[PDB]
Amino acid sequence: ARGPKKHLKRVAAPKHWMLDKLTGVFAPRPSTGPHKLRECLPLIIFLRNRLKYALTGDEVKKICMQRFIKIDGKVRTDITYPAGFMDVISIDKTGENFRLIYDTKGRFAVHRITPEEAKYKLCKVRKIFVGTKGIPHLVTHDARTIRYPDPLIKVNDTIQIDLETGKITDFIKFDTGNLCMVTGGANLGRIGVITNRERHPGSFDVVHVKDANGNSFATRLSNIFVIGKGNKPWISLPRGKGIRLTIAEERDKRLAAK
Amino acid sequence: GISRDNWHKRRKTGGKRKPYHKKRKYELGRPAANTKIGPRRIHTVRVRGGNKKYRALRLDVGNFSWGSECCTRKTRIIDVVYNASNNELVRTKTLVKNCIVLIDSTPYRQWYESHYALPLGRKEEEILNKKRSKKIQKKYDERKKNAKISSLLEEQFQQGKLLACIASRPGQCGRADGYVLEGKELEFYLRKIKARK
Amino acid sequence: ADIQTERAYQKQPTIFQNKKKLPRYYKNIGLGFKTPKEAIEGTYIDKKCPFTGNVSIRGRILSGVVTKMKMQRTIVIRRDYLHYIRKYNRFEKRHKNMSVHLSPCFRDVQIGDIVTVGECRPLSKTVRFNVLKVTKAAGT
RNA sequence: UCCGUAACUUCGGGAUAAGGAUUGGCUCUAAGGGCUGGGUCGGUCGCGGCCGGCGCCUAGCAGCCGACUUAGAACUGGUGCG
RNA sequence: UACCUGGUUGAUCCUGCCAGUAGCAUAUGCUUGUCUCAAAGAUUAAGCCAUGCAUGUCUAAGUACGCACGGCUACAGUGAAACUGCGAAUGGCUCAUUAAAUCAGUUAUGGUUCCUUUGGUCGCUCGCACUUGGAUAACUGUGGUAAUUCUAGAGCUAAUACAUGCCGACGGGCGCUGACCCCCUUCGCGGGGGGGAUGCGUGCAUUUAUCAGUGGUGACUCUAGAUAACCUCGGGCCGAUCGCACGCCCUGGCGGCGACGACCCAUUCGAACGUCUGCCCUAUCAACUUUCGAUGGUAGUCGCCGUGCCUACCAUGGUGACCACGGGUGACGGGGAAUCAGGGUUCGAUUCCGGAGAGGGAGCCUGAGAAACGGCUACCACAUCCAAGGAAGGCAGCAGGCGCGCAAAUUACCCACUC
RNA sequence: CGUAGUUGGAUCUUUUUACUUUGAAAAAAUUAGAGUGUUCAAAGCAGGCCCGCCUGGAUACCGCAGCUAGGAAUAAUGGAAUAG
Ligand SMILES: [Mg+2]
Ligand SMILES: [Mg+2]
Ligand SMILES: [Mg+2]
Ligand SMILES: [Mg+2]
Ligand SMILES: [Mg+2]
Ligand SMILES: [Mg+2]
Ligand SMILES: [Mg+2]
Ligand SMILES: [Mg+2]
Ligand SMILES: [Mg+2]
Ligand SMILES: [Mg+2]
Ligand SMILES: [Mg+2]
Ligand SMILES: [Mg+2]
Ligand SMILES: [Mg+2]
């Protein structure tokens, strides 16, 4: 191309959006924002293909232009705003206050949280740098920036910020035994405690995570998101608590529910 | 136009490679600035990203550093005496990033005579032979201890011409900054100039 | 011990020389490669030495035997590998040459010894790697 | 001067094959040599030496001298230049 | 379904091919009641194209004095046009080019750019404002021309166009300078401790030199700090803008929310150039490359940056029977497709990803992004109007037509769905 | 005859690789395959149960190369002989 792409084909879309291949040729290419394109969830396919509030695309913008949708305490009107992990969608008219967290199969679950849980969120510390006059900064997995963070908060740690304030409330260090969620790869959505952070200089670091059944698995350090301190998750986990059943152990769960 | 691609080169083996696309715009090159000495003439080029880089076609005034006192003044360039890259850039008075230049020394004599009260390169009276109060006159006496410039560098102040060196890239930044040659780097370039004579 | 062979003055651009033994800039590279003694106490100037110059090691780290030592500060190593053919389910010996920058810190390298290289920013038309550790041959 | 040269052949030749470019003046720039001295402390008297403590040019400097030739560049002329 | 049968002899056992047999995909022949899906001018000609369409766009929120409509005193409210802004670099089509190239997996940018979006930052600088200047279009009025999305002359008039430019913060502080006062000694010389006027400088971004060693990295010549400065007139930043609701203090003085814009730092979408490994046939292609850069060194120039990218000065290298180099390809690459016991063989123009080109080449403008072709500028080829003076062109976009051929569809309706 | 190439006897507990196993990271579509009565089937990702409720949109495979941790038979290779 001579410049940046603007469309997105239907079959070339991300798998976890769960679009179908006979509705149209294209998929909603999400706008540029705080989340990556393969790691986001656009607002139109959340309101239309999950919640059934609208039936077409034009009925989504009739919701959004009436300013009924809030993201992170702020009104967003774009139908392809990239919403992502640990984000809070506040509809607030029906009073629902969603929080996007992956299920155990690796797609965004329609997950409801309590309307005082929607005051805050969690963020992974991606970068620490100082600025002019020696002022430290902090960059999250979202594109937001915090001036004057806590001196103990280092890279890959998880902070808890307040929406509508934008300041740091509390943080969790990346340590052994803390409670984390996997945000990428073949273990997308699984939850367990950190067993061992295996270091490799130059290349990627690998973290072994032990599930709450005895199962263990490993993932790169760039996909590990700490969600709890010790064994206590600081959010409300979805239905299943991040346990990946085998394909036999989810057959009988269907078979013992008929 | 002027392309700075790689695909017009032959391969490592010596095989001629065949082009697979027309020459793209991010592979452009532009003509050299060939910055001379004279009254200031600077052109700006719109470059990739919408940015601007300043290319200077004539420059007479620079910003050079004395180095061993952290004394940087804005002085005037007289001429070019040496160029390691091409001998015929000296004859046409072209200023490039490492060429050895020759500058007026009077901002460096004037600062030195004010910081040490000692004549430099002399065979008005107020800054040198001033009546100082004895607390102030005390302060100039520990500066008097370390006031000795090397013998190769006191020669330069008598002719009023320091031998200097460009450090910036004129024709990219539009300026000519650099530092004064001193020490073993001075006497290396001194005998190269004497050998060409 | 006399380095000034070129038309321009050779100096390490971080060491300020004229201050009122000259000091020697050298850095430590990562990944467990020890900076040799001759890079630390020697006097050579090289902006493409990974220890005393402007080369940062990042990316891949490879190995090969020295075959030619005839360019200035650049040798040719042959890394000799073994390619699989699925139809005949047998292997096939291929090789590949590489021009690699060799620093003066490795004093005596001979034709036929194991050289560990690490890649960096491109240094020439063909040179992308840089010698990090010289391991001699058997009986030497 | 610099390029470039076929058929054929007794492999020597064909061959200055054929074919093309360049050439002035002026101002510079490189490169190509030769003769001399590398003597550290008077240890100390027949401003010079007599035998040896006393030292490291040793990647060669420094002085003087000397032909002719090749290559490159800028300028310059009514495109003129073997 | 891991399969064979006929054919050399007078007869036999063989080697061996020819011929059957079964899919697959192109053409074609004869035939064809229903109904659900669905390829479809790739193969020859990346041949040439009549006509039409395929890219424009306005909110309460840049500029309305068009009565073009329109309600009751700068400006109601609609609003054509025009300026300004933004997009037009995506999509779509075709497969000619292209054989470590494209491409794929893998890594890097600690070797670079990045409109927008989102989040920071935006009184950190000591130095007419209750609003500054000029111009131009629409419009009106005179035209020219055979001609076109040609434009001329004259009179108006705007800004988030284009320029120009201040107050406030703002009390100073901090560095240097040092008049000067002051205290404790001293036989004295000397030595010691504060205050200090007057002058110079001061923030980010930029450019160079130097000093020291807040946070980070496997690794910095990283980030941050200190100092001396510089800062391009073809010029870095530091709001002369717009709308909602309008309150509050004593004419004045403050205040809620937005829009729009900003140098810079992140971020997002990427982009570009590198790392490693991987490609069909050919030796009736065995040596190729190199003072017309071939390999490397030093210094630069150019560039968004690393780099023989280019120049100067040097070195004589670099590649090859492990198949270089040269040639071919009925070669775009890949995901894939047909066949298939196990291995394989052949195909992949073709809806997804990546590349390329818009008749052939070449050069560019604008912009964040183009060497753009539903942008200009040439020349070659072709072709279109013409009053002969000139003017305009690019269907490998959708349809359609001609041609080429064994060979391929309607100049249909719609933005309702997808975006 | 002979250089490349290819291939190389036995031997030891009963240094670098190759190998083997595992982990990551690997675009969907297609293929394999799960669930589901498109009236069946090719398909499709839907659906199902009496104010709404319940539930799916699986898993595998993806040569080689590169990365990761176990294994140490086989196969290369390396240490002390002028002891330097
Ligand atoms: Mg096989
Ligand atoms: Mg003849
Ligand atoms: Mg018969
Ligand atoms: Mg047959
Ligand atoms: Mg396109
Ligand atoms: Mg990016
Ligand atoms: Mg062909
Ligand atoms: Mg193109
Ligand atoms: Mg055509
Ligand atoms: Mg073009
Ligand atoms: Mg067209
Ligand atoms: Mg047909
Ligand atoms: Mg054996």
Q: What residue type is A157 in one-letter code?
A: D
DSSP letter (8 states) at residue A117? G
Based on C-alpha coordinates, what's the Rg of chain C?
Answer: 18
Give the C-alpha distances (Å, rounded to integers) separating A195 from A34, A228, A230: 30, 14, 12
Q: Give the chain C residue nearest A204 (alpha carbons).
A: C59
DSSP letter (8 states) at residue B106? H
Which residues, 6 or more positions from A180, have their beta carbon under 8 angstroms from its beta carbon?
A191, A192, A193, A194, A207, A209, A224, A225, A226, A227, A228
Phi (first) and psi of residue C72, to 5 degrees: -75, 115
Report the C-alpha gap between C135 and C116 in whole angstroms. Answer: 8
Chain F: nucleotides under 7 Å from a protein CB?
A: 5-6, 23-29, 34, 44-46, 57-59, 63-69, 77-79
Contact B146, C20 (CB under 8 A): yes
Q: What residue type is A251 in one-letter code?
A: R
Question: What's the CA A1/C1' E363 distance, rounded, in angstroms?
Answer: 22
Using a CB-CB cut-off of 8 Å, the residues of chain A touching C32 are 201
- Tokens for A125? 């510390």
Touching check for A214 and chain C: CB below 8 Å?
Answer: no
**B143 and B131: one domain?**
yes
The residue among C59, C73, C69 whose CA lies nearest residue C124 is: C73
Model resolution, angstroms: 2.8
- Tokens for B144? 């008097």
Helix (H) or strand (E) holding A225: strand A224-229
Helix (H) or strand (E) holding A254: helix A251-255
How many beta-carbon pairs below 8 A join chains B and C?
A: 29
Q: What residue type is A47 in one-letter code?
A: L
- Residue whose token pair is 């050079």: B64
Can you tell me which residue has its alpha carbon closest to the C1' of nucleotide E276?
C60
Give the C-alpha distances (Å, rounded to integers) separating C31 from C35, C59, C119: 11, 11, 13
Contact A148, A115 (CB under 8 A): no
Which residue range(s) make up the domain with B190? 31-105+161-197
DSSP letter (8 states) at residue A34? S
Q: What residue type is B28 in one-letter code?
A: L
Contact A89, A50 (CB under 8 A): no
Give the C-alpha distances (Å, rounded to integers) separating C133 from A97, B15, B164: 59, 33, 40
**B143 and B64: one domain?**
no
Domain borders along chain A are 1-116, 121-171, 174-244
Report the C-alpha gap between A144 and A47 in whole angstroms. Answer: 25
Helix (H) or strand (E) holding C79: strand C74-85
HSE (side-chain half, CA atoms, 13 Å) at C75: 27
Report the C-alpha gap between A237 and A226 in whole angstroms. Answer: 13
The residue among C126, C65, C80, C67 whose CA lies nearest residue C101 is: C126
- Tokens for C126? 């063909």
**B51 and B124: one domain?**
no
**B40 and B90: one domain?**
yes
A35 burial via Cβ count (<10 Å: 0-12, 13-18, 19+)? buried
**B18 and B74: one domain?**
no
The structural domain count of chain B equals 3
Helix (H) or strand (E) holding B137: helix B134-142
Nearest to C126 among B12, B146, B183 (CB): B12
Chain D: nucleotides under 7 Å from a protein CB?
A: 28-30, 59, 62, 72-73
Which residues, 6 or more positions from B177, have their beta carbon under 8 angstroms from its beta carbon?
B62, B63, B64, B65, B166, B167, B168
SS3 A146: strand
**B166 and B141: one domain?**
no
**B97 and B165: one domain?**
yes
The residue among A54, A62, A63 whose CA lies nearest residue A93 is: A63
Contact B68, B42 (CB under 8 A): no
Q: Chain-centre distance of CA A227, in angstroms?
A: 11
B44 Cα–ligand 10 center, Å: 27
Q: What residue type is C113 in one-letter code?
A: D
SS3 C138: coil
**B114 and B85: one domain?**
no
Q: Using the CB atom, is residue B130 less than 7 Å from strand E? A: no
Question: What's the CA A81/C1' E112 distance, rounded, in angstroms?
Answer: 29
Contact B84, C6 (CB under 8 A): yes
Touching check for C30 and chain A: CB below 8 Å?
Answer: yes
HSE (side-chain half, CA atoms, 13 Å) at B134: 0
Contact B42, B174 (CB under 8 A): yes
**B59 and B21: one domain?**
no
Contact A28, A37 (CB under 8 A): no
**B59 and B101: one domain?**
yes
Q: Experimental method for this entry?
A: cryo-EM
SS3 B185: helix
- Within A65-188, where are the H helices? none
Using a CB-CB cut-off of 8 Å, the residues of chain A touching C28 are none
**B112 and B92: one domain?**
no
SS3 B63: strand
Q: Give the chain C residue nearest A203 (alpha carbons).
A: C59
**B76 and B170: one domain?**
yes
Report the C-alpha gap between A186 and A166 in whole angstroms. Answer: 33
The residue among C23, C20, C10 whose CA lies nearest residue B66 is: C20
